Write a protein that binds this ligand. Structure first.
Ligand code: ZN
Lengths: 98, 95, 362, 108, 81, 98, 80, 107, 94
DNA sequence: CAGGATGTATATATCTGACACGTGCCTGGAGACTAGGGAGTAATCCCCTTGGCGGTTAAAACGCGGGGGACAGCGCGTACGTGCGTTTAAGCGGTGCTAGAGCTGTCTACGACCAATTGAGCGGCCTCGGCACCGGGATTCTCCA
DNA sequence: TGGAGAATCCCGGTGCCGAGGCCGCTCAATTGGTCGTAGACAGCTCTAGCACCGCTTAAACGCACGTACGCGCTGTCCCCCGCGTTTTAACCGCCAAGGGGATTACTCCCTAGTCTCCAGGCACGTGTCAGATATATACATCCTG
C-alpha cells in the first residue's frame, strides 16, 4: 500500500533533474581505464594529462546525449515511446556515420 | 623562464563591466570566452584569406573582412557587425 | 599425296574413338571433383575447370593414358613484375584490397609464394579424391620440379590427369602485350578490341632457375583467345562450318604437329621444342594470309609445303615471335641451342626429302 | 618632438587590441600584406560579438539570483538565441548541460 | 587492461538517456550504446595519438584532444581552444 | 482486359530506369527562370553564365535525391511504404537543417 | 512570376524514383518545393556575395562552386 | 660546362610534376619555408591516389564494353569502395548518377 | 593569350600506365582535375596547421606524412605513406 | 500451371564530332653559388603523472511484483497508381546586338622594414564576499473513493 | 469533486576558497622615416549572354477506375519500471618517487634569392574512329484464365 508510484513518474522526475544539472554522468575511474585500454593499441607506454581525459569525457557525454535525442525523435516517429536499437541505427544512418 | 602567455581576458572583462556593471565571471567561463574569440577570429581570417586568393590579390583589406563577415554570420548579426566595423574604421581614419 | 595424310588423320580419329570413352570417364571423375571442390570450405571456393575444348586440336594429349584439364581461379587485384626481361615470366603481387585478401598466408612478404599455395592445392585435391572411392582413383606425387598433380585411375586401367592450377585476372592485358595479337588488318579491329577485353591467365612454371625466387614466377596464358581465333581461323569466320568453305588450315596444323610429335619422340635429343612453336608459327601464317583461296583442302599438300618454307624462314633469321608478346621472342639461343634448332632443320630436311615415311606407319 | 603615444584601439574607439590583432594577422600566414584598416574592422566585429553574448549571459545569470556568469549561463544564452545558435551550432561547451525540453507525447 | 567497456554501467547509460529526454528504454540498448561509444572513442584517440607522436612527446595533452575533435566537426570550448 | 499492370510494377520499372541514367530530371527553362527570380532579390540586373545555372541544377538535383533516400528510410522505419511530409521533416531534423 | 510551379509533379516523381521511392503521398510536392526553394536561396545568396566582392555583374560557375564548397557540398566537374 | 637538366620528377621516378608542386606550395601561404623533400612526398601521394581511382574506373569502363572513361565510371569507382567513398563522402560528381539499389521491402 | 595550366598531362600519363588501351572523356578529365586540386588543398592545409601547432616555420616530409595519416582512411594511408617514403628515398640517392 | 502481351537486352549499318597526336614557342623550371637564420643537439631543472594505502559511503547489482505498452490480427474506405486522350510549352536551330569581362600600360599612394622609447599587460600575492552546504519548516503534486 | 504521503521550493546561518585588485617589470606596440611595388584607373577588344522567331513533338495535364495500403480498433502477454536489500569499489585525503616536458646555449646545414639558359607544357590545327542512332530479333518477365 505505502506509496507505489505509477510507471513513468520517476522517469519524468529524472528527466527534469538531469536536464537541469551540468555534472558528468559517467564514473571517472572506469572511463579513464577504458580510455587507456583503447589507446594502448595505437602506442604503448603512453601517459595522459588529467585535462585530456576530462576533455574526452565531456566530448563523449555530449555526443551520446545528442544521439539519444535523435533516437527519441525516431521512436516518437514510429508511434512508440520505448527506444530500441532500430532507432539508434536509423539515427546514425541518417546523420551519415554509416 | 616563466613563458608569458597571451589571452583575451582583460578585454572580455572590460566589455563585461561595460555591458553589465555589476556582474562577475567565473574562470571556466573566461576560458570559454577565450576559446570563442580565438575560434571566430580564425574563421573570419581564413575566409578573408581565401577571398583574397580567389581574386588574384595579395592583401587583406577591410573590404575582405566585410565580405567574410557577410558570408559567415547569419541574418541580423551580419548587419549589425558590418555597421559596427564600418563605424569604427570611419572613426579611426579620422585620426 | 593428301590421301595418305587424310587417312592418318582418320587414324587420329581412331585414337579419338578410344579417347571419347577414355576422355568421358576422366572428364566425369574430374567433373565430380569440380563440384566437390566448390562446396568445401577453403581458399579454393570458386574454382572452375577452364574449358578449351576436348579435341586433339583443343587439348594436351598423346598415348591414350594421359590427359590434361585446366582449372581456373579468379584472383583479386593483381600487380605483375617482369622477371625475365624477355617478357615471359612474372612475379605476382596484390594491391590495396580494402575489404581483405583471403590469401595473405600464401605470400612471402609482398610476393605470392606459388610453392606454398600449390602445396595446399596438392594436399586438398589428394584428400578430396581420397574421400570418395566410387572409381579406383589414386594420387601420385612425383619430384617437385614441374608443379602438376597427376591422378592415376585404374578404371579400366591407368588414367593419368595432370591438374594445372591457373589464376584468372580480369584487369588489363599488361603493357608487355600492347602490340600483341596483331590481326587488325586480317580479321578486323572490332574483334581485336572484343578479344582484348577478355580476361587472361597466369600459370605456375619455374623458369629455369638462374634466380632466387623459384616457383614464384608465372607465365602468361591466353588459351581461350587462342582456341577462339583458331576455331574461327579464317578471314571468313565461317570457316570449319557448313555456312562457310572448309579450308586446309586445321589439316596443316594437325599434319605438322603430329609429324613433329613422331619425329621428335623418335630422336629424343630435341625436347626443348614444344607444341607452342607450331601454334605461334601458324598464328603468324594465318594472320599474314590475306586470301581465303590460300587455304583449300584440294591444295593441302602445296599449302603444307609453303608452310614448311615459312618454317625454314622462321628458323633462318633467329627469331620466332610470341604471337601475344613480340618483345618476348622465344627463338633465342639462350633457351634453344643454335645447333639444336639447325639439327631440327636437318631433321626437317630428312622429313621433307623422304616423302613423309614416318607417316607410312599405322 | 615625439608626441605622446596613443593606442590604435583608442583612436578606433574599441576595447579590443588592434595592435595584437594586427600582429596575429601578420604572423598567421593569411596573406603577404595586411592593410591598415583590416585589424580595426576585425577588432570591432569581435568586440560586438562578445558583448552580444555577454549581455544575454548576464541576463540568464540574473534570472537565477546569481551575480557571476558560469558556463551554464553561456549555454543557456547561446541555445536560446536563434542567431547565436546557428553560429555556434556545432560547438560543445564544457559543463554546459542541455536545454530543458520534454516531448509533448511523453507527458501524462 | 581488458574488459573495461563494462565499466560503462547500465545505470549510467540510463542517466545519459534521461538527459537526452527519453522516458522508456529497451533492454538491448546498452550493448548498442557501448559499441557506439567505443567506435567514437577509437576515432578520437587515434587522431590525438597521431598528433602526440608527431610532436615527439610521450604524454597526450589536452590540446591534442581538442585538435582531434576540431578536425572532426565537434569543436569543444573550455580546455584551451 | 488488355494489359492492366498491377499497382507497383511500373513504379519499380521507373526506379530501375532512373537509377541507371545520368541525365537531369528537371526541365531547364523553368529551373533557370526560378533561379533568376530568386536571385533578383539579392541584387537587380544580374547575369548568369550558362555553366552557373548548370552547376546550380546539378547541385540541387543531387541534394533532393539524397534527401529522398533518407525520407524513404524513415518511411520504411515507420512500417510504411508511402513517403509523407512527416518523413521529410524527420530527415531534415535529424540531419541538422532545422 | 511564381516559377516554383515550374518544378512540376512528374519531375518530383522522377527525383523520387532515382532515390528508390515506390509510393508517394499527395502532400509531398508542396513540401519539397519549399525545401528546394530554401536550398537555392542559401546557395544563391552566397554566390551573389562572391560576385559583388569581385565587382562583377554576372555570376560565374566559380562563384557557385565556392558557395557550394563553403557549405560542405563540394562539386566536381565545373572548374576548381 | 653545364649539367644538362634532369627534372626532379625523373629523379623521384614519378609522373606528376615536382617543381610545379613546389611552386604551388611556396606561393600558397602555407608556411614561411618549404623543405626539399615535401613536394616529392606530396606528388608521390597524389600520383598514388590518381592511379588508384583511374584503375577502378577503367575496370568499370571495360565492364560496360567501353573504351573511354566517362563521369559515370568515376562515380561507380568511388561509391563501390569503402575507403574511397569515405574520402569523398560529401563530394558530388556532375553527371555521375547514383548507385542502383532498391530496398528489400519494396519488391 | 591567357595561358592556364592544369594536370591533364600527368593524369593521361598515369592512365596510359595503368590501362594502356583506355581513353578518357573531356568531362572526366575535368573531374580528375578538381579531385587533384581538392586533395592537394586538403593535405597542404593540414600540414600548415600541423607546423603552426608545433611553433615551426617550415613544411617538411614529416608534416606531409602526418597529414596523410590524418586524412586518409584505413589501408589508403599505409600504401600512400609507403609510396611517399619510397619516392623520397629514391630522390635523395642522387 | 500456360499461353499471351509487353518490355528489354542484343545484334548490325551509318554517320559524326570529339578525342588523340603533331607542331611552334615562350615562360617557367633547373644548375650553380652565397648568406643567414631555423632547427637539431645536449644539458638541466622541476613540475606533474603514476603508484600505493586506508576508510567511508554512495552507487551498482540483484530480486520481485505488476501494469502498461509493444505487437499481431481484422476490417474498411479512400487516396494513389495505371492508362488514355488533349493541350501547352520546352527544346532546337538560326539571327542579331551590345554589355561587360578580360587584358594592358602608368603612376601613385600604401604597406613592409628598421631604430629608439615607453607604457600596457602578464605573473605573483593577498583578501574578503559570493556561493556551497546543512537544517528546518512550507507548499506543491501524485495516487483513490 | 476530497486527503495524505513525499518531493521540492524557500528561508536562515556558517564558512571557505576563488575572483578581483594591487605592484613590479619587460617586451611588444607606437612614432617617425624611407623605399619599392601592388593595385587603382583609363582605354580598348571581342566574347558570350540576352532577346527574338518559327517549328516539331515530347512531356505535362486532366480524368476515370479500382485496389491495396494506411489507419483505427481489440486483445494478449512479456518486459520494463518502481522499490528494497546487499555488496563493492569509486572517491577522498595523503605521501613518495621519478619520467619527461620545457627552457637555454651553441653550431651547422638547409633553404631563400639571383642569374642565366633551355626544354616542357600550352595553344592551335587536323584526321579518323568510338559511340550515338535507327532497325530488326530474340529472350524475360508479368499476368490472368
Ligand atoms: Zn576451316
Amino acid at each position: 500500500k505505502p506509496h507505489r508510484y505509477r510507471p513513468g513518474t520517476v522517469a519524468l522526475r529524472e528527466i527534469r533533474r538531469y536536464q537541469k544539472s551540468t555534472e558528468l554522468l559517467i564514473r571517472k575511474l572506469p572511463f579513464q581505464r577504458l580510455v587507456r585500454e583503447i589507446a594502448q593499441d595505437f602506442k604503448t607506454d603512453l601517459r595522459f594529462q588529467s585535462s585530456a581525459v576530462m576533455a574526452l569525457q565531456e566530448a563523449s557525454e555530449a555526443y551520446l546525449v545528442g544521439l539519444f535525442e535523435d533516437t527519441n525523435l525516431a521512436a516518437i516517429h514510429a508511434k512508440r515511446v520505448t527506444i530500441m536499437p532500430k532507432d539508434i541505427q536509423l539515427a546514425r544512418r541518417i546523420r551519415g556515420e554509416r | 623562464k616563466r613563458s608569458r602567455k597571451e589571452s583575451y581576458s582583460v578585454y572580455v572583462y572590460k566589455v563585461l563591466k561595460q555591458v553589465h556593471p555589476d556582474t562577475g565571471i567565473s574562470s571556466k567561463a573566461m576560458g570559454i570566452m577565450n576559446s570563442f574569440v580565438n575560434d571566430i577570429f580564425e574563421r573570419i581570417a581564413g575566409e578573408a584569406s581565401r577571398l583574397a586568393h580567389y581574386n588574384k590579390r595579395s592583401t587583406i583589406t577591410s573590404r575582405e573582412i566585410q565580405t567574410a563577415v557577410r558570408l559567415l554570420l547569419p541574418g541580423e548579426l551580419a548587419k549589425h557587425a558590418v555597421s559596427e566595423g564600418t563605424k569604427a574604421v570611419t572613426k579611426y581614419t579620422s585620426s | 599425296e593428301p590421301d595418305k595424310l587424310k587417312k592418318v588423320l582418320d587414324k587420329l580419329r581412331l585414337k579419338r574413338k578410344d579417347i571419347s570413352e577414355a576422355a568421358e570417364t576422366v572428364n566425369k571423375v574430374v567433373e565430380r571433383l569440380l563440384r566437390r571442390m566448390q562446396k568445401r570450405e577453403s581458399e579454393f571456393k570458386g574454382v572452375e575447370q577452364l574449358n578449351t575444348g576436348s579435341y586433339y586440336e583443343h587439348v594436351k594429349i598423346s598415348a591414350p593414358n594421359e590427359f590434361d584439364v585446366m582449372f581456373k581461379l579468379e584472383v583479386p587485384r593483381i600487380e605483375l613484375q617482369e622477371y625475365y626481361e624477355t617478357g615471359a615470366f612474372y612475379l605476382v603481387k596484390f594491391k590495396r584490397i580494402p575489404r581483405g585478401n583471403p590469401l595473405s598466408h600464401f605470400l612471402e612478404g609482398e610476393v605470392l609464394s606459388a610453392t606454398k599455395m600449390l602445396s595446399k592445392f596438392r594436399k586438398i585435391i589428394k584428400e578430396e579424391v581420397k574421400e570418395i572411392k566410387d572409381i579406383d582413383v589414386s594420387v601420385e606425387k612425383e619430384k617437385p620440379g614441374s608443379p602438376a598433380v597427376t591422378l592415376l585411375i585404374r578404371n579400366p586401367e591407368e588414367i593419368s590427369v595432370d591438374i594445372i592450377l591457373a589464376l584468372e585476372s580480369k584487369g588489363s592485358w599488361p603493357i608487355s602485350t600492347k602490340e600483341g595479337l596483331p590481326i587488325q588488318g586480317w580479321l578486323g579491329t572490332k574483334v581485336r578490341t572484343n578479344l582484348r577485353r577478355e580476361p587472361f591467365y597466369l600459370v605456375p612454371k619455374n623458369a629455369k632457375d638462374g634466380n632466387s625466387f623459384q616457383g614464384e614466377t608465372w607465365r602468361l596464358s591466353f588459351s581461350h583467345t587462342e582456341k577462339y581465333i583458331l576455331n574461327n581461323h579464317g578471314i571468313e569466320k565461317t570457316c570449319c562450318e557448313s555456312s562457310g568453305a572448309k579450308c586446309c588450315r586445321k589439316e596443316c596444323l594437325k599434319l605438322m604437329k603430329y609429324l613433329l610429335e613422331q619425329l621428335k619422340k623418335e630422336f629424343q635429343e630435341l625436347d626443348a621444342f614444344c607444341s607452342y612453336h607450331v601454334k605461334t608459327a601458324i598464328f603468324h601464317m594465318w594472320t599474314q594470309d590475306p586470301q581465303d583461296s590460300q587455304w583449300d583442302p584440294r591444295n593441302l599438300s602445296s599449302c603444307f609445303d609453303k608452310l614448311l618454307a615459312f618454317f625454314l624462314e622462321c628458323l633462318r633469321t633467329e627469331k620466332l615471335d610470341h604471337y601475344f608478346i613480340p618483345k618476348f621472342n622465344l627463338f633465342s639461343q639462350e633457351l634453344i641451342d643454335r645447333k639444336s634448332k639447325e639439327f631440327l632443320s636437318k631433321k626437317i630436311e630428312y622429313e621433307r626429302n623422304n616423302g613423309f615415311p614416318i607417316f607410312d606407319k599405322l | 618632438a615625439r608626441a605622446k603615444a596613443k593606442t590604435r584601439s583608442s583612436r578606433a574607439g574599441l576595447q579590443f587590441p588592434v595592435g595584437r590583432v594586427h600582429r596575429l594577422l601578420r604572423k598567421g600566414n593569411y596573406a603577404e600584406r595586411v592593410g591598415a584598416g583590416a585589424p580595426v574592422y576585425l577588432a570591432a566585429v569581435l568586440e560586438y560579438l562578445t558583448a552580444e553574448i555577454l549581455e544575454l549571459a548576464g541576463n540568464a545569470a540574473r534570472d537565477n539570483k546569481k551575480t557571476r556568469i558560469i558556463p551554464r549561463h553561456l549555454q543557456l544564452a547561446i541555445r536560446n538565441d536563434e542567431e547565436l545558435n546557428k553560429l555556434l551550432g556545432k560547438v560543445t561547451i564544457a559543463q554546459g548541460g542541455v536545454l530543458p525540453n520534454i516531448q509533448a507525447v511523453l507527458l501524462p | 587492461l581488458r574488459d573495461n567497456i563494462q565499466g560503462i554501467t547500465k545505470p549510467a547509460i540510463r542517466r545519459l538517456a534521461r538527459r537526452g529526454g527519453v522516458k522508456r528504454i529497451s533492454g538491448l540498448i546498452y550493448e548498442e550504446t557501448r559499441g557506439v561509444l567505443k567506435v567514437f572513442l577509437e576515432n578520437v584517440i587515434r587522431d590525438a595519438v597521431t598528433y602526440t607522436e608527431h610532436a615527439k612527446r610521450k604524454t597526450v595533452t589536452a590540446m591534442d584532444v581538442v585538435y582531434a575533435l576540431k578536425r572532426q566537426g565537434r569543436t569543444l570550448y573550455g580546455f584551451g581552444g
